[PDB]
């Protein structure tokens, strides 16, 4: 009985973290692509671009949060 539950919750949390990773990667792709394009004259605004690159980082967070709570269930 325990064999099914643990593997099933494991594949579920893997699904969650993988999809969150894909979403944040898609976001960071275009964000950084625009940033490095603007960095030519944005030598003053390099830090300004940096804070935009770190905003999509939040999407991973909920994914590994629910992964952690499901692992704690295991």
């Amino acid at each position: 009985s325990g064999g099914l539950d643990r593997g099933l919750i494991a594949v579920g949390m893997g699904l969650a973290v993988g999809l969150a990773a894909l979403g944040t990667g898609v976001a960071q792709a275009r964000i950084g692509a625009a940033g490095v394009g603007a960095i030519a004259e944005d030598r003053s605004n390099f830090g300004t671009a940096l804070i935009f690159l770190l905003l999509p980082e939040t999407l991973v967070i909920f994914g590994l949060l629910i992964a952690f709570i499901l692992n704690g269930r295991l």
Binding site: S44, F46, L55, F62, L65, F68, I69, G72
Partner: protein
Amino acid sequence: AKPFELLVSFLNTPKYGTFDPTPVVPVFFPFWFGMIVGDIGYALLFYLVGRWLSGYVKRNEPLVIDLFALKLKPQVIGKLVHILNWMVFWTVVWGVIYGEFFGTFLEHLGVFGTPEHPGLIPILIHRIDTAKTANLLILLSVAFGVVLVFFGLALRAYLGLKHRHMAHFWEGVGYLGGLVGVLALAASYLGNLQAGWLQGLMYLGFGVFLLAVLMSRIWLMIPEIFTQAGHILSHIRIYAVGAAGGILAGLLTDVGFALAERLGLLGVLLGLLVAGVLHLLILLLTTLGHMLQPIRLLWVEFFTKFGFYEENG
């Protein structure tokens, strides 16, 4: 206590009347940054970095940089050193009220006691018992978030009290009414399911919300309560970030132990070096986001209601 205003200054300036913005960041931001960063080995490295900057602050030495065009060094380095060596205290105390970080090969080397290592005093939290401890600290974190939003709404109400366009103070207490209403609803659905004193709470919250509507037909007021609801929830990331860091440190420790137990006659020598370089390389990218997260949280959550929009004074 004053020099923390560096972060506040270059946005927050506004058209006068505001009182609150400056004392809140030294009493909040380093605390939650330290809660995020529980690695004492990282904290001592940051202390040594502060020592490295202290070797430059004594001279003028603007020290420039080739890449990022940094020049504004001379005296702001003093207050930057002040804020960093203020926050290292919070991160080191968090690292000791938290679990151990390095060296604690609890399979054989229990540096501080545990039920799996009899002897000295047991550790308070280990994050294997995550079934209970994680739930309690999540409740603690969301409590901090909701009380911070409470203080923000309270200071908005205080502003509305003095300023005679207090019609906005009415919608301000409407914010708190919506918050207590959704709190009662959550306690009804996923709470302990009782409704004895909860009935009065939902009654008062819903009633004062309709009275807030009765002030004027504000079309923008009815959807934004959903945004306010997500705002208290957004604070929850603070545990997940520090849990990710702690699991990183734990798995590095386990890898080092595994290398140093089997090939131990030679595995220790390579293992210490590889563990050090891996920890440093992980640090150099992850700590940027780690330090960037809570200040963004504080900005977007706290300043968004009262002081952000007034066209910089």
